[PDB]
Design a protein around this ligand. Sequence first.
Ligand SMILES: O=C1COc2cc(C(=O)N(Cc3ccc(C(=O)Nc4ccncn4)cc3)C3CC3)ccc2N1
Length: 133
Amino acid sequence: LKYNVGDLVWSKVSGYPWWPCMVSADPLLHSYTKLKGQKKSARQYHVQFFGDAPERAWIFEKSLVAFEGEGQFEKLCQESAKQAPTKAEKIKLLKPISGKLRAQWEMGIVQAEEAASMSVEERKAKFTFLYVG
Ligand SMILES: O=C1COc2cc(C(=O)N(Cc3ccc(C(=O)Nc4ccncn4)cc3)C3CC3)ccc2N1
């Protein structure tokens, strides 16, 4: 497996910029990786999106990149724009992101860069979400 709980990754979701994340256990499934439809081609990882408006998701491994730092972001943007197969898909990819989401992303980057400087256990202790059902 490429990742484990506490590993830092960028996640790409349609409609959002590459976003800093931490691999975590799903609080119901008690799993951090699975194969969608039990297809060997469809491995997903469970991730927390860093920032002040917490979200989690199951994300395909094909849409994860190991997180080093904010310095990666420009290349990630450039490669996604070059890979957009059509003019129409590229226009969708490049739509502006709100100021409110930009500030969430920027706070996410601060958390992820702090997380990177920490041990796996330290970052899990600090950043793991609380769930209430
Ligand atoms: O500060 C922050 C941090 O997190 C954010 C995430 C998002 C967002 O809607 N996303 C896109 C996104 C896509 C899908 C899901 C998703 O399946 N949620 C699930 C799956 C299973 N059970 C329950 N929910 C969730 C999110 C993430 C950023 C790509 C927007 C703003 C922020 N601001």
